[model samples]
Target: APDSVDYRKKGYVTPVKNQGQCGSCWAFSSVGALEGQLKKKTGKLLNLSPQNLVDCVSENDGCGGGYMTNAFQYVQKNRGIDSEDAYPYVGQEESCMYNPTGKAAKCRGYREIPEGNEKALKRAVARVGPVSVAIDASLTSFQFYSKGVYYDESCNSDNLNHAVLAVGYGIQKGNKHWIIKNSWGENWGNKGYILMARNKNNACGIANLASFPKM
Candidate 1:
């Protein structure tokens, strides 16, 4: 972890997503950026199946409503996600593994990326794709997520509402942080993780947070 640099300095702004009542956010937030990175990397925007990731990936335990990291871990297996229609996101825990006998052509236009290191995260964003991430979930602000790259650690840890995406980054006041996007229906939360609190001086949870790679 010592090798890790303040990505905020590099400008990796992540996004936001409202779990709502579906408890399926871990899937959306994780896959949203996966879509971005895949398109950015390969010029393809294949619709991924969050339903499949929720259902098939045992690690996720979907309906149970788990942390964002669980979703990323599930995708890392390389089984790859399915299409929303192919799996039809019912948006609940009830999941059924698509039977090979049925042979529904799993849509495949891009390779779901696996987890990677700092080099991998940056590469995914810079060269290959947009990397998805899960954060502490509390320090959100902005009418549409533009400024304020410092999360308030004072918030209770239980406040992590849902998952989000890491699309871009920038620097201000000699400090650096990521530029995050959100999916709280364009209204809910701070324009979606625009400037999540950074950890340049090990100030915020940034030093302790874990952002998984696309898979």
Candidate 2:
């Protein structure tokens, strides 16, 4: 894995999930990162609950968008998280169903790298699991991105509006791209994945707030 890496083929990534019309992208990203860490440590793929964060976490707004950092804090303070089957996802916000007596996986804590650094971001992803990141997802084409290396010069990093999971990285014909796992469902991107341009001055603000949890 010196030259390239792909977590999806390595059995680290779980099935793609949709966030629906709700702005719960951060929940999916945070949960995806948690699940990735769980798989790496336990050698078992498990789907955690994003709805649990959407409903339970009070530090951030549910369905109105939130931060992965706060979500990680919530997980750490809650002792552990439950499986998607136990909690389930309703897309929209709801009352907290977090049972203190019943939980699934837990992490020690989380960390973040310096802003606007792809090298550090890549290292974090390789050393850790998936990294939760925010990006400028305001573009219209980003909503319909299907395939190939996606790079819109118009997509500004100054206005990061969406959250996603950087599951892996790869180089294709000398072009490096980050394997992005989206929450827009399986119908969007490449089977719910997007190859974002990497090392392009923090393209899409992907490196602005890259972070992962400690297992």
Candidate 3:
């Protein structure tokens, strides 16, 4: 595998979005990874809708939190997901107004990267495209992250509370980090992204619940 990869540079990652005050990060994470898979298969990038998943995935607690796996399953069973322009994000749960005509991305299912294994996660990002991952986003450092490789000793590898997408990885100043795409809009982190410390015993539980949609 290559030493570095960035889906954004390849036009596989969609623009960064915002989840607002709602606990809909899981939906965004799932849709982000699925959008990447769609681009890999169709050679076209399309913005998938997180609001569709938030409102329609009945198994998950809409706006209260959910799992990316469940969202993927919902999309798979639904045959596909809608475009962001079709459903649009209101940042909170709403009635399932999904329209079949708006379907833009479809997947066979999803796969989970080996738990707590950053090497496998890196391989997945390099070869499989963007991946959905759960991480500890409760830290104040994370809440205000802006630049540089983000690392905090207080980050717990077992207490993941938020979900995001792993779009790529690379070494900066000899420091290995994962390029994580967040749904907090362009005003957060490195323009809605973070260079998180990698290969450090799964810092922030990055590899703990990693998964991605299958093309």
Candidate 4:
């Protein structure tokens, strides 16, 4: 019932990536979640651009600014976002522009839910698909990151700027872990994403994950 909870489940999921040095953490995670969710929902591997979301979305902010749910709301209601071909994927601190002409149903991806509402978030993922979340990634997130679904509540990560996805979770060696995919350049941590421990099952909500169903 408490927000500090993670419901580890056995399902199809992908590795998490990291968005290095980019204030567009929200955008990275939002798009990553959409990609993952879309895979879960339709079994398609879609590589949506978080950079486009960073530059385009009006309701959300770029870099270290913006809310996950708000970004999702904008995408879903707007019928998916444009591709890198139109918007392009740049690093953080790069200039962005909103495309009024890129509005089309085929271009739309998934809508993400706001963070904090962990219970609702879990319900949404269980009922719908995966979700993207941001967390206080500490030094450990990089270590053993590629091991698969993880849970490390002891990290007390508060540096909520990096973006990642909540794919699937499971009990590895009797511990609860949430599957996460990062966007921080493959050079950093676990070739990108890592499994974060749900120590309390609240990691998703704690990071204020903004998830969207890629359907």
Instruction: Give one digit per residue, the lDDT tens place, for model 2 in 1-215.
Output: 34578888889888999899899999999999998889889899988989999998899999998999899988998878878888988988899988655576988889997899999888988878688999998898788898788899899998999989998898877789999999888988889988999998899899998788886
Off by over 4 Å in 4: 1-18, 37-43, 92-123, 139-154, 157-161, 199-210, 213-215
Q: Give residue 75's error in model 2 in angstroms.
A: 0.8
User: For residue 135, what is the lDDT in candidate 3?
Assistant: 97
Model 1, TM vs. native: 0.62
Which model is ahead, 1 or 4, in terms of TM-score? 4
User: How displaced is residue 45 in candidate 1, in Å?
Assistant: 1.8
List per-prediction Cα lDDT, in the order shown: 0.50, 0.88, 0.93, 0.58
lDDT of 3 by residue, 1-215 (tens): 79988889999988889899999999999999998888889898989999999999999999999999999999889988999999998998899998999889878888999999999999999888999999999999999999899999999988999999999999999999999999999988898999999998899999999999886
**Candidate 4, residues 15-92: lDDT per residue as tens digits?**
444455667777766665665555555665645667766765677667657766667766777666664455666666
lDDT of 1 by residue, 158-194 (tens): 3445455655444667655655656556564444445
Could you say which candidate leads in TM-score?
Answer: 3
Candidate achieving higher TM-score, 2 or 4: 2
The lowest-lDDT stretch of 10 consecutive residues in candidate 4 is: 1-10
TM-score of 4: 0.68
- Which RMSD values do the candidates have, in order? 6.7, 1.2, 0.8, 5.3
Error of 4 at 119 (Å): 6.5
CA lDDT of 29 in candidate 1? 61
Which structure among the candidates has the greatest lDDT?
3
